[PDB]
Amino acid sequence: AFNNNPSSVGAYSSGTYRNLAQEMGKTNIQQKVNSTFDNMFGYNNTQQLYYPYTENGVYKAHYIKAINPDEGDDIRTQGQSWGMTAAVMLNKQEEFDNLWRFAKAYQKNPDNHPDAKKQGVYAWKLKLNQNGFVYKVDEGPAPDGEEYFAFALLNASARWGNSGEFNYYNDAITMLNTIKNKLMENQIIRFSPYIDNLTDPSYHIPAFYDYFANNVTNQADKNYWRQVATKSRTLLKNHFTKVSGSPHWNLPTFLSRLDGSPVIGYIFNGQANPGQWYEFDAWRVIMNVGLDAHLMGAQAWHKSAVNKALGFLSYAKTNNSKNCYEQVYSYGGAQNRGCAGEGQKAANAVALLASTNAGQANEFFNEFWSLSQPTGDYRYYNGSLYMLAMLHVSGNFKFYNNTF
Ligand SMILES: O[C@@H]1[C@@H](O)[C@H](O[C@@H]2CO[C@@H](O[C@@H]3CO[C@H](O)[C@H](O)[C@H]3O)[C@H](O)[C@H]2O)OC[C@H]1O
Structure with a gap:
């Protein structure tokens, strides 16, 4: 049966990971998790998201393909870093290494880039050109990418050691310093190096920062990351307070001020969607809250955030002609x-x-468990989250500490 009283002691502390699928009475859980990975990382062109990159017939590395029928397929640090995270959770070293080789070679901006704000950060959008060779479309970072790279690399170090192709640990510490120096404002993760007082709630994963704190060696950096963790919980707490009731009706938003205030409308040239939309980024917020509650312990704010958000979506479904809740809401209103x-x-x-x-x-669990693995033109985002969810709900998303 579902444990409706999640512990205030996290799995990271106790070493006790929940198996949500098991609680819900599902069978063949591990088989389903394994097949999910095999299909995403298999050459089937169906669920597949993991693709080899070759140059003049010479194998180089692999990438997660952000399939896009609307603007053309591209390659994203977000998907790349998620792919590595999935791989390390299932002990899939070759897949991890092939993805990390790609990121290091092709996504990383040079440390001597003329723009100091771009030095050592990871270009968020790559494409293959008309001749099949990779290039950077946009050199700007999507900082949740770097966050997951650091997380994945620290775990790779812990699981596999650092004497092979990659010194995962050194790569991880380099990534953390890059986040600290390029992608933070007042210890809150940036949406952009070029805009101040701006965060993206979906980038906040407080448990990752606690994990970072326990995997750096020096006192100053240990304290730094623990403070990032606390400030992130505060940001999320503040954001959920501000979206509670009218006018945001309990769903977190795309963009936020550093005090948790939803960004209203457009604020910069190039912005994809209004700041106050519960849209594609925002989907991840309560997923992150669930992650944090599981890993670091469930507090009153975690439960309130999720109970009220799911409560809204359930209500929104009853007031939908298609009997579904929708992908995008703004001020509690469906955006079609x-x-x-x-x-x-x-x-x-x-x-x-x-x-x-x-x-x-x-x-909510049965609606997810009854799904087939995403296929088709929109499987990048759906398939990536599906993979991550499968790990989270099967007790396979774990923190592996390094030893010193
Ligand atoms: O990098 C991430 C992007 O990949 C993400 O892109 C959106 C993914 O979803 C698309 O909408 C699909 C439309 O068809 C069906 O309804 C699918 O279920 C949808 O997923 C959007 O068009 C893309 O913009 O956005 C978030 C970003 O973090």
Whole structure:
């Protein structure tokens, strides 16, 4: 049965990881997790997201392909870093290494880049040109990419050691210093090096920062990352307070001020969507809350964030002509951007790790568990989140500490 009283002691501390699928009475859980990875990282061109990159017939590395029928396929640090995270959780070293080789070679901006704000950060968008060779479309970072790179690399070091192709640990510490120096403002993760007083709630994963703190060696950096963790919880707490009730109706948003205030409308040239939209980025917020509750312990704010968000979506479904909750809401209003897909349902399943409502849990978990693995033109985002969710709900998303 669903544990509707999640511990205030996290799995990171106790070493006790929940198996949510097991709680929900599912069978063949590990088989399903394994097949999910095999399909995503298999040459089937169906669920597949993991693709080899070759140059003049010579194998180089692998990437997660951000398939895009609307603007053309591209390659993203977000998907790359998620791919590495999935690989390390399942002990898939070759897949990890092939993805990390790619990121280091092709996504990393040179340390002597003329723009100091871009030095050593990871170019968020690559494409293959008309001749099949990789190039940077946009050299600017998407800082949740770097966050997951650091997380994945620290775990790779812990699991596999540092004497092979990669010194994962050294790569991880380099990544952390890059986040600290290039991608932070007042110890809150930036949306952009070029904009101040701006964060993206979906980038906040407080448990990662606690993990970072326990895996650096020097006192100053240990304290630095623990402070980042506390400030992130505060940011998320503040954001959820501000979105509670009218006018945001309990869903977190795309963009936020450093005090947790949703960004209203457009604020910069190039902005994809209004700041106050619960859209594609925002899907991940309660997933992250569930992650943090599971790993670092469930507090009152975790439960309130998730219970109220899932509560809204359940309500929104009853007031939808298609009997679904939708992908995009603004001020509690449906924006007609389609019924929830696999990735959103996956994000919402992980959120259940902070839920205290067995009824909610039953509905949201079964909607996710009944899905087939994403295929087709929109599987990049849905498939990536689906993979992460499968790990989270099977007790496979673990923190592996390094030893000193
Ligand atoms: O990098 C991430 C992007 O990959 C992400 O892109 C959005 C993914 O979802 C698309 O909408 C699909 C439309 O068709 C169906 O309804 C699918 O279920 C949807 O996923 C959007 O068009 C893309 O913009 O955005 C978030 C970003 O972090």
